[PDB]
């Protein structure tokens, strides 16, 4: 079966009435199945829409509006899935098919359109107008012997769901990769995604991974792995592209840094941004819009901050900055420069590397800490040097108790909080240093893995006066807080999942909360051993 992407332009018109039709044909030419919506609009009179005879199915919605053509031959349209709706809850909407020229739509022969799978219908302003898992009709009592499936299809077969990628192994209590499993390309179960398509994080085969996800490769097949946090978005820095003749980050350009994670260039924050420059028709920047930069984790060039919100205590907007590569440097010298700011702490608690270029922290009369860092740790290139000059004296900073926290290591801090330490004196929980992990007390219970506390599995049972786990897994528990499926603490026994031989496996609860196998005869559930279960 031939497949086209579809369209979602709505009542939009693509160019001249001729340009609109010329682009409608190229998409829906020889197409048999529409993955998206079938949108027929602004079709003029005497325009041959005869290529629409090939269409056998539509997944999304169908739209026929503002057409003055006499005939729209949908003589083979067998099904409308209604994956989407056009407006409100109309899966099929045929609206205002006429013109002020006295020529509307006469013939809409949808002779084969038996079922609409989802959604209602809307008709207005048109003056001239069997198995168990099947859908349209049936050329037999079986499932294969059906015209079109209801849910999915898998080589003639009309299943309600595609064969799972994995099947529960009742032996080792683990999962195994199903050799009969297939991806869900449209309402079809294909053993492999088609040409130039990508696997979802679960199941289907789509051309675009989309947001919150990126494209990774696994077993020769490009898949769509979810983005750990915001997806990576490279962006141009000051001086480049959008900001060619730009002097600083200003109220104008600040918006374009939205959702950026990596800056390909430099980053300048100068006082002119806060004053505004009439000579460039640039208004004052409101400091709050700096929060946009919180998504920035890396900078290829340098970071220059000569101006900063006086009421803001630290470089908050860079709390997530991880690295400055210093591939480009101020005066060929500096990769980090912070001069004459009101801040009290730098606050770069996520900074772990400055690959090249020198550091200059100068004139911040209230700036404490800063001298506690051993910047050698951050440097990657030799000859890199720091200059920390004319900021607030250590002794003044002591008098007001602005010193690295007691849980910080001697390596220093970016500020007074435990989450500002460079490294921890004992252990860390999250991005925070602490005294001890919750081994024998506290919520949640956890275990240590390299100077770090890690939450025990929530299915492990807290032991008074002892530990509760040894590893991230539920197999590493000591006592299962609820049920047990072999080496596995569980909140519910396995009941309904598929297995080998294409049989849904069932389990029940032994009074010791241990999951055991029901009798094979019991297929819809069971609450005990023997036949008496079901």
């Amino acid at each position, epitope marked *: 079966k031939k497949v086209c992407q579809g369209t979602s332009n709505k009542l939009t018109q693509l160019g001249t009435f001729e340009d609109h039709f010329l682009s409608l044909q190229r998409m829906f030419n020889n197409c048999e199945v529409v993955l998206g919506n079938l949108e027929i609009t602004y079709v003029q009179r005497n325009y041959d829409l005869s290529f629409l005879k090939t269409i056998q199915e539509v997944a999304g919605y169908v739209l026929i509006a503002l057409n003055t053509v006499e005939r729209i031959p949908l003589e083979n349209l067998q099904i409308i899935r209604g994956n989407m709706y056009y407006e409100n809850s109309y899966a099929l909407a045929v609206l205002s098919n006429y013109d002020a020229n006295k020529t509307g739509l006469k013939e809409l022969p949808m002779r084969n359109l038996q079922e609409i799978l989802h959604g209602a219908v809307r008709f207005s302003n048109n003056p001239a107008l069997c198995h168990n898992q099947c859908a349209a009709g049936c050329t037999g009592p079986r499932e294969s012997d059906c015209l079109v499936c209801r849910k999915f299809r898998d080589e003639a077969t009309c299943k309600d769901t595609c064969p799972p990628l994995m099947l529960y192994n009742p032996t080792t209590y683990q999962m195994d990769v199903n050799p009969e499993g297939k991806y869900s390309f449209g309402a079809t179960c294909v053993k492999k995604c088609p040409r130039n398509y990508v696997v979802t994080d679960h199941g289907s085969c789509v051309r675009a991974c989309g947001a919150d996800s990126y*494209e990774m490769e696994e077993d020769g097949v490009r898949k769509c792995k979810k983005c750990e946090g915001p997806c*990576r978005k490279v962006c141009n820095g000051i001086g480049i592209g959008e900001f060619k003749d730009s002097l600083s980050i200003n109220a104008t350009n600040i918006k374009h840094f939205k959702n950026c994670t990596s800056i390909s260039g430099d980053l300048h924050i100068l006082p002119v941004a806060f004053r505004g420059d009439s000579f460039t028709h640039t208004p004052p920047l409101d400091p709050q819009e700096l929060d946009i930069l919180k998504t920035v*984790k*890396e900078i*290829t060039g340098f970071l220059l901050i000569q101006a900063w919100p006086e009421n803001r205590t630290d470089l908050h907007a860079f709390e997530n900055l991880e690295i400055i590569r210093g591939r480009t440097k101020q005066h060929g010298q500096f990769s980090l420069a912070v001069v004459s700011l009101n801040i009290t702490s730098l606050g770069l608690r996520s900074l*772990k590397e400055i690959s090249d270029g020198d550091v200059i922290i100068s004139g911040n009369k209230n700036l404490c800490y800063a001298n506690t860092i051993n910047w050698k740790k951050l440097f990657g*290139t030799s000859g890199q040097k720091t200059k920390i000059i004319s900021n607030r004296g250590e002794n003044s900073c002591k008098a007001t108790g602005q010193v690295c926290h007691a849980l910080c290591s001697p390596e220093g801090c970016w500020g007074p909080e435990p989450r500002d330490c460079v490294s921890c004196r004992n252990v860390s929980r999250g991005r925070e240093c602490v005294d001890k992990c919750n081994l024998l007390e506290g919520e949640p219970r956890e275990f240590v893995e390299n100077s770090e506390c890690i939450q025990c599995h929530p299915e492990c049972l807290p032991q008074a006066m002892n530990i509760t786990c040894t590893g991230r897994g539920p197999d590493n528990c000591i006592q299962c807080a609820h049920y047990i499926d072999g080496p596995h603490c569980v909140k519910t026994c396995p009941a309904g999942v598929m297995g080998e031989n294409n049989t849904l496996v069932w389990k029940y609860a032994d009074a010791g909360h241990v999951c055991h196998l029901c009798h094979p005869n019991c297929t819809y559930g069971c609450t005990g051993p023997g036949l008496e279960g079901c």
Partner: nanobody
Amino acid sequence: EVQLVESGGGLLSCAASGRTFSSYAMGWFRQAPGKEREFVVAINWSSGSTYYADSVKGRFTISRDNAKNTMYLQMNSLKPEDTAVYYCAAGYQINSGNYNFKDYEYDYWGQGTQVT
């Protein structure tokens, strides 16, 4: 601090010491006399995922020896169509990878191992 020691080539080893290469990604680049420098191989350090170039695909083999901090490369079944100078590179990555390798960044480079 970050030193890349190259040793093994002529008519391939990259010993990388200097810091915690936890989120790092090291690879190998090449430059031909009368052209630009070009990708050849790369390998994430954690995990040990791997990415090859097309011409390099199959005909090469890269690996990582943890703890020893070294990145080896095999140039088995080479050809006159692959003669150039070879640099091993290294770079910190934003999230230990988890984005396309063609957009990885490299800050530290080796000296220059010859291959004729």
